[PDB]
Amino acid sequence: MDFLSNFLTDFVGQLQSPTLAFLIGGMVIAALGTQLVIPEAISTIIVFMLLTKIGLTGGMAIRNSNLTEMLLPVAFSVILGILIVFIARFTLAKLPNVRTVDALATGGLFGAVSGSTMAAALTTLEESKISYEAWAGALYPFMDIPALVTAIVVANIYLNKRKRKSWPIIEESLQGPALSAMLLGLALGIFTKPESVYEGFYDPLFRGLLSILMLIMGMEAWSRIGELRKVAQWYVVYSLIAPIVHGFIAFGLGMIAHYATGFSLGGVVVLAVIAASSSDISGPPTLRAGIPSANPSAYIGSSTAIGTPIAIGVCIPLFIGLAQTL
């Protein structure tokens, strides 16, 4: 039981961690020139082979675990996935002039991430004291598959009832790169035994390859946050606040499992930081071929530029301190 004095010394040392240090280490070079560029072939084998580590981890956790205890955490994740896009359909919409709903339901892409909460939460979760379950990454496909289709279906059915009337929807999204690269991980995690290729090639160079992909995402965010000044003054305010308010409606909704079906308080924090995350890798390859009328800076510049630096900044050392309070 320790105050906000313990918070500030965590935030300095968690900004100093090697995942976010390259992100703000890529912004600071892009403000200085830097003709450095990683080619497009490397940045599409880092998008694969880093969404296969998450599929294999979630797939291996379903074999060696009972399917009794993993009902309440996944029914509080599907419901927690669908709820986020409807809140943003009521929160961010009823606003001044930037209320282009198809560029606003996609701004509620806030599903789950790879860059944090699988390598940021889990490496500071068991760094200090507290332990968690085996199915950390098994809550990644849930709240990512349902949280993106409801962005598509809502923003597609809203367009037909206004401009035209003045399975094939989910099929083009799920059949695509960086989302069939994850379902290949689950089917080979549930059915087969890849314990010699996961631990040895996909698992040791996972934390390292994330730092290359948070260098691309850092220095392609310097111009895109400057181009965001053209769009609005309200996507900034939604970006600083909604990664906070999506945690507390998940932290209390995750506080039902504790007083019902296990789900250790050390696991609730690995459910509440997942829901405040703003997808980066599974996100923009979808929601662009699914929703073409997109304005592709409102939902990317609010997730990779302001979204995840606050999602690793002021809410993972927050909910560790909330977990240490109990």
For residues 295 and 231, the answer to whether their CB atoms sit within 8 Å is yes
Q: What is d(CA 236, CA 225) in angstroms, rounded to the nearest whole number?
A: 10
**42 contributes a contact to its own copies by CB under 8 A:** yes
Q: How far is the CB of 97 from its own copies (least distance, A)?
A: 36
Structure tokens, 303: 């997730």
Q: What is the DSSP letter of 203?
A: T
Out of 7, 10, 29, 100, point to the residue binding its own copies (CB under 8 A). Answer: 29
**Scanning residues 228 to 267, which ones bind its own copies (CB under 8 A)?**
none
With 0-12 / 13-18 / 19 or more C-beta atoms within 10 angstroms meaning exposed / middle / buried, residue 267 is buried
In angstroms, what is the minimal distance from the CB of 6 to its own copies?
Answer: 19
6 binds its own copies (CB under 8 A): no
Q: Compute the distance between CA of residue 194 and CA of residue 301 in angstroms, rounded to an integer.
A: 37
**Closest C-alpha to 88, from 230, 269, 278, 270:** 278
Beta carbon of residue 34, minimum distance to its own copies (angstroms, whole number)? 5
In this structure, the number of other CB atoms found within 10 A of the CB of residue 202 comes to: 20
Q: Which of 8, 71, 79, 123 binds its own copies (CB under 8 A)?
A: 123
Q: How far is the CB of 17 from its own copies (least distance, A)?
A: 7
Work out whether 16 is an interface residue with its own copies (CB under 8 A): yes
Cβ proximity to its own copies: between 205 and 241 the closer is 205
> What track of x and - describes contact with its own copies for positions 167 through 206 (by CB under 8 A)?
----x---xxxx-xx-xx--xx--xxxxxxxx-xxx-xx-
- Report if residue 93 touches its own copies, rule: CB under 8 A: no
